[PDB]
Design goal:
2 copies of one chain form a homodimer. Helices cover 37% and strands 17% of the residues of chain A. Chain A is α/β, with parallel strands linked by helices. Chain A folds into 3 domains: 186 residues, 3-Layer(aba) Sandwich (Rossmann fold); 163 residues, TPP-binding domain (Rossmann fold, 3-Layer(aba) Sandwich), CATH 3.40.50.1220; 190 residues, Thiamin diphosphate (ThDP)-binding fold, Pyr/PP domains (Rossmann fold). In chain A, strands 9-8-7-10-11-12-13 form a 7-stranded mixed beta sheet, sandwiched between helices. Chain A has a 6-stranded parallel beta sheet with strand order 2-1-3-4-6-5, sandwiched between helices. A 6-stranded parallel beta sheet of chain A has the order 15-14-16-17-19-18, sandwiched between helices. Bound molecules: thiamine diphosphate (2 copies) and magnesium ion (MG) (2 copies). The site of one magnesium ion has 9 residues of chain A, from α17.
């Protein structure tokens, strides 16, 4: 005790999760996990945060992982885990270190092949773990005898790859005896790679660094930011991995998005005589539909799974090790110019809100130490090109792209870092998939600033195909009235409807000033209105499907 | 004259769905399915009914299948299909004929291994179909060259087993040329079975029939009802398959649920000298936690996959064929007694609503031509033992048991049969998983009667374990205000809060009398209050988890 005044498998697991920095566990109870839940409740250093549904729990855990750099959620066998599998798939796709723990029937029930609830009534308790094979780095069915080694095996894999892992925990196994862990869970080619990077950087007249999502996966953002700061090297990111570095840096160019990039940025990146890519993956939504021009012959790329050193593929290295050794490199100093930064100002008028002006306003009015979360749709494509201020972060999901993700994810990330004010931009159509976590936000007294873009349906879809087709319409809810209906009082959530630029600036400033309440702001915009980037990208998506 | 002088694969699929009796398709759009969606919208013989999310779509299609006897829903590759997989799993477990169509990228994009949205950025477009293997009777990734062959193969499997099937439809393949279908979608073992059943019923002094969920799967309820009506044979069902026969039959005994059965029913079933089981599976929730006593030595059981004739296993037979020939059997009339019908007139008072009184009232007030839908929790436990009136049906999901299922499922079933008044009983905890389909119910102008049991959290869980544990609490929404907030007007949805027995009788009668609006009724019950059946199963589950 600070004042100076049987251990089980459940305790072992929770101890290991604590070691990973996890302070909150998400999910949904079921009879197959209640005993383990008791253990979570009893922890002084860990809080149960129950969700309305499992899909939302999985999304929330993903957002938490993006910020905390590890996460866990708990589901029940079959119905819980299968509800959550799309969330876990997104965590696999975008490489987030999420542990799913699945409570399962007792070892005896499983061995007896009983036709119990949440099964296919065939006596087989292994189907659902098999179904997770493509979306997990490691998976285990625990037994009393295997539990400590298996837990350590799968969580060690979480540490190695920062991809999701899966632990099936039978009821009787969680209560089984265990011994406390004795030890914590925590170079030639790597030195050759570093030497070639050093040589290349010092000989380059116009180097450029491109940072991506795998930097975020490993919590290497501050490391890369420090490296770029010290060396003055020009740096860009894709929108997949936005905020992999601090965007306030004088050498940060903007977001490279293939032919849809700002022209000076495009020209700079594509004329660089050496390119260092750190944790980047080139996807349709992050390359202007594969219209990038990045010359492999002038490139060293480093990824979790492999590196390419001027076309020579290598696999025998640790990504984290190499990236963290970059500031061992001395004497690198870029002495050239970057690109002209446009002056950021927003003066509101009484005009109705438009998409392009909205994102100009958000860019101006966003502060340091904030996290911007932006949903697939007009929100992602608008918010993705805003220059973030110092110590600010971004969460977007351009590879997996599962609409609805951002609402629970924003809440999870907000819980992970309560000192970073979260601003959520989510469309009406996307909010409808995951709205029920409003209850959690109220109960947990979270204070994010949430902007709901009511444009009367699926505007991004209208831009790709069928602008006046009925399937792009959705039932219109009274979005501003949701918090009240879900149990919020005025001292917890402030709700607003905003139609004009003046109203937007007033409410945004009001929200930013008032750090002790959540803001729920319904923005009204025209269905035909799309930000410039999406007007272009919509047609490229359409072309990709021809 | 005085002088003497483009049908496509998408069309083919939709024509086949029409053949199955499907008039509505559920789901959620995405760029990979929008062009196929145009084809649905253009159909005169079926309607697109867009959902808020895909999990709910899959639930809705399941409910539709239970009543319509076939169903389909449409998702987008990766994100849509994985969101829906828990619903499809439930359709597999409880054997409902649901077709999931997944719109996927063009074959060129798939063949090139492009890192496109809704993938793991590994160029592999086959992971998600593989993940469906354990929960689908058949599956296909269509090509232009195999499309009609594969559609017919998988839909023929749906007709054979009445289990869910899966069709991945690439954008370019749906638009590919096709020819209209040339053929329509379509022994001694069976004679021996029928002869042995006939013989056994002739020799029995006290036969009992047990009908189960596979009767519902094949749309054989009327067939079984007719057979039982003609022969006067005693019949029971489990709660798994409730309404597999019409419960208004003179020879219908009630629900057999192991040692939790009503005593005279239990005694009758367990002393029967011959047992004929039709489409039954014995599961924990449907056997009083495996406390049934059904002697295989006195039993012929018929299932879709298997028959057991006095311990002798048979496979080579058509379940539907055999059941449909039962009325051809001769000399099998039952001339004995059944069990006594207890009667008490329900007399309401001003007393606050309690669980056992609630279900007493519902039994007294339920009418012919209704479908009762009951969610896992106190609703299922209470509602499952109500005697249904003539031409009335029941939907519950005791094997898969995915809470939230029943709200979209009730709406889907209600769309499937507009002439059966659906009464939904769903708990507060469960409604929170799937509440967003309230928008669809308003748009489609459905008129179900919905009862939301507000008992301030997960009462069934409190009965299993941890009655005062915080994980059994949920954020309390203002449930009665949901329709207004989701855009309903008073000409569409009537919302009420009900606290007393008098209020309940008044509102239920009011609801039943007003066929032209939807009713949204918040029932207030105490968290500690459980129906008498649950006061028993609560413990049995707890024991099962020891
Ligand atoms: C789970 C899931 N279902 C469907 C899609 C396809 N999809 C992408 S964007 C989009 C529309 C989003 O609309 P909204 O949130 O209203 O954004 P807007 O463009 O109108 O601002 C849809 C349906 C998806 N990406 N994920
Ligand atoms: C998808 C899913 N998650 C979790 C469970 C476990 N579970 C079974 S019943 C139940 C509680 C349902 O509570 P409620 O709907 O409020 O019913 P009641 O209070 O009337 O018992 C839970 C969480 C489940 N069956 N399915
Ligand atoms: Mg919208
Ligand atoms: Mg409840």
């Amino acid at each position: 005790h600070s004042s100076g005044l049987m251990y089980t498998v459940g305790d072992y697991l929770l101890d290991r999760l604590h070691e990973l920095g996890i302070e909150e566990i998400f999910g949904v109870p079921g009879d197959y996990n209640l005993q383990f839940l008791d253990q979570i409740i009893s922890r002084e250093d860990m809080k149960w945060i129950g969700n309305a549904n499992e899909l939302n729990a999985s999304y929330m855990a993903d957002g938490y992982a993006r910020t905390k750099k590890a996460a866990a959620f708990l589901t029940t066998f079959g119905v819980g885990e299968l509800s959550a599998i799309n969330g876990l798939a997104g965590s696999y796709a975008e490489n987030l270190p999420v542990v799913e723990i699945v409570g399962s029937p007792t070892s005896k029930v499983q061995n007896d092949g009983k036709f119990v609830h949440h099964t296919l009534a065939d006596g087989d308790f292994k189907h659902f773990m098999k179904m997770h094979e493509p979306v997990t780095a490691a998976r285990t069915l625990l037994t009393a005898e295997n539990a400590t080694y298996e837990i350590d095996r799968v969580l060690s894999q979480l540490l190695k790859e920062r991809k999701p892992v899966y632990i099936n925990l039978p009821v009787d196994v969680a209560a089984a005896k265990a011994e406390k862990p004795a030890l914590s869970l925590e170079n030639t080619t790597e030195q050759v790679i570093l030497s070639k990077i050093e040589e290349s950087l010092k000989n380059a007249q116009k180097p450029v660094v491109i940072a991506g999502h795998e930097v975020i996966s490993f919590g290497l953002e501050k490391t890369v930011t420090q490296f770029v700061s010290e060396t003055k090297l020009p740096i860009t990111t894709l929108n997949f991995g936005k905020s992999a570095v601090d965007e306030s840096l004088p050498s940060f160019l903007g977001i490279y998005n293939g032919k849809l990039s700002e022209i000076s940025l495009k020209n700079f990146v594509e004329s660089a005589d050496f390119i260092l890519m750190l944790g980047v993956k080139l996807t349709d939504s992050s390359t202007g539909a594969f219209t990038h021009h990045l010359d492999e012959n002038k490139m060293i790329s480093l990824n979790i799974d492999e590196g390419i050193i001027f076309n020579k593929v290598v696999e025998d290295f640790d990504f984290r090790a190499v990236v963290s050794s970059l500031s061992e490199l001395k004497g690198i100093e870029y002495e050239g110019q970057y690109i002209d930064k446009q002056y950021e100002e927003f003066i509101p008028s009484s005009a109705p809100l438009s998409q392009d002006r909205l994102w100009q306003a958000v860019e101006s009015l966003t502060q340091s130490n904030e996290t911007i979360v932006a949903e697939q749709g007009t929100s992602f494509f608008g918010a993705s090109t805003i220059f973030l201020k110092s110590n600010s972060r971004f969460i977007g999901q351009p590879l997996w792209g599962s609409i609805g993700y951002t609402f629970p994810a924003a809440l999870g990330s907000q819980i992970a870092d309560k000192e970073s004010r979260h601003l959520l931009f989510i469309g009406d159509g996307s909010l409808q998939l995951t709205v029920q976590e409003l209850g959690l936000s109220i109960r947990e007294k979270l204070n994010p600033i949430c902007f709901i873009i009511n444009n009367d349906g699926y505007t991004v879809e209208r831009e790709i195909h069928g602008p006046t087709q009925s399937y792009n319409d959705i039932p219109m809810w009274n979005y501003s009235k949701l918090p009240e209906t879900f149990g919020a009082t005025e001292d917890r959530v402030v709700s607003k409807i905003v139609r004009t630029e003046n109203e937007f600036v007033s409410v945004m400033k009001e929200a930013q000033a008032d750090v002790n309440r959540m803001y729920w702001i319904e923005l009204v915009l025209e269905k035909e209105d799309a930000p410039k980037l999406l007007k272009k990208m919509g047609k490229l998506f359409a072309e990709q499907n021809k």
